[PDB]
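step 4 of 6: structure.
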Amino acid sequence: EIEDAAFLAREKAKADAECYTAMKIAEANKLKLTPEYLQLMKYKAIAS
Amino acid sequence: ELMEAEKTKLLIAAQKQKVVEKEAETERKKAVIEAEKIAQVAKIRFQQKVMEKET
């Protein structure tokens, strides 16, 4: 029971930490993901 | 003569029986006390483990 109490709260922190990062990546994506950058990544994805 | 020796040898066994029974009972009591000791020690260890997990 103690371990369940500890683990459940641990996963809330992980969910919050990932949720905050995702919104921050979402905010950056608006400026980063321009047509030119998308084309550049398109052509870089096949170099290997 | 050997026939009569066997007659008394029966009597010796009738008392060695009680001696062996008492020794076995003593061993039983010692083992039970040891088991109770282990039980109490385990109880203390489990309390310590619960405190461990709270911390």
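step 5 of 6: annotate
 - Chain A has two helices and no strands.
 - The helical segments of chain A are 2-32, 35-44.
step 6 of 6: archive
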